[PDB]
Amino acid sequence: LRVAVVSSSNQNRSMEAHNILSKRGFSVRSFGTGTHVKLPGPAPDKPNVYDFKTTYDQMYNDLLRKDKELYTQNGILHMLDRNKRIKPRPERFQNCKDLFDLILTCEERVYDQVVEDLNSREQETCQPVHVVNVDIQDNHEEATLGAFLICELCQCIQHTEDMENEIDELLQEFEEKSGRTFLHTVCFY
Amino acid sequence: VPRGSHMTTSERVVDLLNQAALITNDSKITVLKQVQELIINKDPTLLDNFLDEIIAFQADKSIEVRKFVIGFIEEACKRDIELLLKLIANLNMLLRDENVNVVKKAILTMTQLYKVALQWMVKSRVISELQEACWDMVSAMAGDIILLLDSDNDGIRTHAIKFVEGLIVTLSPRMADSEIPRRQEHDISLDRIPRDHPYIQYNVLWEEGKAALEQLLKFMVHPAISSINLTTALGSLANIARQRPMFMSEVIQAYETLHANLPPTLAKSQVSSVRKNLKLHLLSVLKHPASLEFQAQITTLLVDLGTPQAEIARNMP
């Protein structure tokens, strides 16, 4: 099962999922659909802002020299180190050309950006890819709980005979067990 | 490849085919893809010679092996469409595989081959009794895929919708306002079929294209239609509308019908997913220059779905 997990900045929700899925033997890539990268700052209204070209290591260093103590206490330096250990930089979904069975998005806005983008690429093959959303709030604890939920869903899917025929029924069971809604659509390669 | 430059391609092919026989897992596909590349692209004069050796893998127990064989049939027929004479039977038998992933791959391959076969028929100087029968086979297989819209399997229905979409577009003419994918510039379409062709009848194909569209419009108002099949059909209609704007009328009508009669069996999140796709496709049709004639209706639907005015404007000319 080839999965892509997509958030806004490719920093937290998708990287937490990337990490769990990867360690659990899934084939997984992660992306963000945001215009730029956003990281928490010293007040909820003053985030740090970066270009998608910027490396996790460059963000780490920039934050280290800004306020070492703040970005230690808020888990961000450790997050960026964790991310550096998976890959060198955040990846923008709109710039990749890879094939997945399943694309999971971490909030509705990201799901709209994934759908808008895939729906605007010319289909060559008409092979479907399933796109599923779950709303996960952008903080560490939610990213972690959401990553486990996503891992559980992926595992269910690994286990079904016929993914396309059973996936809706599975999502409905997940809605019921989690109380969280799961939007679901297909796009075409 | 060590000493490759000293080998003939045919020798290399036989070596690789025997190698593939030695291997008892999916990595044999890597070998068989090297064979494919050599007898389709490096030296296609070897394609006929080795065809049976590749096609023999259609009986392999591996799902991925049989999918590989379907892809090979696809490439072999694009290289040399006359091979359909001896491969249409195999492709139709693979449409009928016990495994749904093999079935689905066969549907996508027919979606590529039907139009290649029809071009072949249109271009053919002379036409044999065998080539007529081969066209009967392709055409009956197209009919079988249209019937897969009534499959009990959701993934097969989704693939059948995509085949049906391609068929409607092939069997209707390009027009001044057709928005044509770059890849497809030289694909055959109705307007390219001479009215006086000795075998392929323009009028018959026109009627099949319309009947294919009717089947799809009927499917869409089926009470049990699944969330994925309905979103697939919505996107198929938007593609059709943009490539063949004489059907834009039919598409807007379907969209209005769906908007006023949402299929009651859709769960809450399914209704939302569909509604979000309805809005996406309406905006997509609005951007198309031929949507001039439908703009008030499209705008009304979009306002009903909660689209802000500023977003509607952003999608106007």
Curated annotation (Swiss-Prot), chain A:
Coiled coil: 155-181
EC supergroup of this enzyme: hydrolase
Entry GO CC: cytosol; mRNA cleavage and polyadenylation specificity factor complex; nucleoplasm
Organism superkingdom: Eukaryota
Entry annotated with the keyword ATP-binding: no
Keywords: Coiled coil, Cytoplasm, Hydrolase, mRNA processing, Nucleus, Protein phosphatase
One GO molecular-function entry: RNA polymerase II CTD heptapeptide repeat phosphatase activity
Oligomer status and interactors: Interacts with GTF2B (via C-terminus); this interaction is inhibited by SYMPK. Interacts with RB1. Interacts with CD226. Interacts with SYMPK.
Family: Belongs to the SSU72 phosphatase family.
Protein name as catalogued: RNA polymerase II subunit A C-terminal domain phosphatase SSU72
UniProtKB/Swiss-Prot annotation, chain B:
Signal peptide bounds: none
GO cellular component terms, A-Z: bicellular tight junction; cytoplasm; cytoskeleton; cytosol; mRNA cleavage and polyadenylation specificity factor complex; nuclear body; nuclear stress granule; nucleoplasm
Region (Interaction with HSF1): 7-101
GO biological process terms, semicolon-separated: cell adhesion; mRNA processing; negative regulation of protein binding
Keyword annotations from UniProtKB, A to Z: Cell adhesion, Cell junction, Cell membrane, Cytoplasm, Cytoskeleton, Isopeptide bond, Membrane, mRNA processing, Nucleus, Phosphoprotein, Repeat, Tight junction, Ubl conjugation
Main localisation: cytoplasm
Entry annotated with the keyword Ribosomal protein: no
Statement: the UniProt record of this protein carries the keyword Cell membrane: yes
First and last residues of every HEAT repeat: 8-41, 44-78, 81-123, 130-169, 204-243
Annotated localization: Cytoplasm, Cytoskeleton; Cell junction, Tight junction; Cell membrane; Cell junction
Tissue expr: In testis, expressed in polar epithelia and Sertoli cells but not in vascular endothelia. The protein is detected in stomach, duodenum, pancreas, liver, fetal brain, carcinomas, lens-forming cells, fibroblasts, lymphocytes, lymphoma cells, erythroleukemia cells but not in endothelium of vessels, epidermis, intercalated disks, Purkinje fiber cells of the heart and lymph node.
Membership in a protein family: Belongs to the Symplekin family.
Function comment: Scaffold protein that functions as a component of a multimolecular complex involved in histone mRNA 3'-end processing. Specific component of the tight junction (TJ) plaque, but might not be an exclusively junctional component. May have a house-keeping rule. Is involved in pre-mRNA polyadenylation. Enhances SSU72 phosphatase activity.
The record's note on its domains: The HEAT repeats have been determined based on 3D-structure analysis of the D.melanogaster ortholog and are not detected by sequence-based prediction programs.
Further remark: Could be used as a differentiation marker in the differential diagnosis of tumors.
The protein's assembly and partners: Found in a heat-sensitive complex at least composed of several cleavage and polyadenylation specific and cleavage stimulation factors. Interacts with CPSF2, CPSF3 and CSTF2. Interacts (via N-terminus) with HSF1; this interaction is direct and occurs upon heat shock. Interacts with SSU72.
UniProt-recorded name of the protein: Symplekin
Encoding gene per record: SYMPK
